[PDB]
Amino acid sequence: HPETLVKVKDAEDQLGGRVGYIELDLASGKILESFRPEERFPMMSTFKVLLCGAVLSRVDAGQEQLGRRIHYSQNDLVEYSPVTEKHLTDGMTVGELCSAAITMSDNTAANLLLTTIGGPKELTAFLHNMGDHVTRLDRWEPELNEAIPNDERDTTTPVAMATTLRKLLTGELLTAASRQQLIDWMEADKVAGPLLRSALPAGWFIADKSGASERGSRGIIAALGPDGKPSRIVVIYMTGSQATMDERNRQIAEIGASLIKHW
Ligand SMILES: [Ca+2]
Fold first, then answer.
1. What CATH number does the domain containing 146 carry?
2. 36 C-alpha to ligand 1 centroid (Å)
3. I need a surface site. Which of 52, 93, 102, 168 has the fewest CB within 10 A?
4. What is the chain written as a DSSP string?
């Protein structure tokens, strides 16, 4: 029942640490509501959407193909690689790797993709090149995660991430086909059930990507809207608390319910 902003502040009171929140209109790009919009939070696995954005950009520039098959070895596997560990013989295409990174948060998939473009620093250059001088990626998986306190490495701000996500999903930075492919992968997210999706009514569209660090942090970026069409971008970051994963998940779910009931 509580207003979104009230619920967000409540969440922070309960969890400790900091909670960052922003809602932007997809069409206009106007900020509808926010909390700690310009403060830095760790991106965690939410960066994987940006990564595949840079990938699709290379596809649009004719420097990459989603169908290009990549072979790797057991030496390349890092923690949490549910998809890539199953394809040591047949490998995976660039498209499949992006699907795995986004829909399953596969870590090796992200690392392989990062190699195709020259590493974390090259992703940062891509961000700078599209007008995002705030967001920065510094490390690989899984080090880029968890999460030492307000160390600026591998961080963004609610408003920076939201603005950058809007530029990727709308506008002419990517071709229409690539824009659709990006949101398609996000729609198929398979590991964000307990979050915003748990509070979404029937017939609503949602495309999202979550992130998490063993202890302290949690995040979700999403494009959602009623009647099977996305109309708003929501970004929620949490960090610096000693609360359990269950509590973190619950608070996000409650913030999502407030957003919907007050749409
Ligand atoms: Ca507070």
1. 3.40.710.10
2. 10
3. 93
4. ---HHHHHHHHHHHHEEEEEEEEEETTT--EEEEESTTS-EE-GGGHHHHHHHHHHHHHHTTS--TT-EE---GGG--SS-TTGGG-TTT-EEHHHHHHHHHHT--HHHHHHHHHHHTSHHHHHHHHHHTT-SS-B----TTTTSS--TT--TTEE-HHHHHHHHHHHHSSSSS-HHHHHHHHHHHHT--S-TTTGGGGPPTT-EEEEEEEE-SSS-EEEEEEEESTT---EEEEEEEEEE---HHHHHHHHHHHHHHHHHT-
Catalytic-labelled residue, pool 45, 81, 99, 241: 45
Q: Resolution limit in angstroms?
A: 2.0
Please identify every residue whose CB atom is under 5 Å from ligand 1, which is an ion: 12
Residues in binding site for Ca(2+): 12-13
State in Å: Cα 9 to ligand 1 middle: 6
Q: What domain range includes position 106?
A: 1-263
210 is catalytic: no
**Options 3, 38, 85, 143, the catalytic residue:** 143
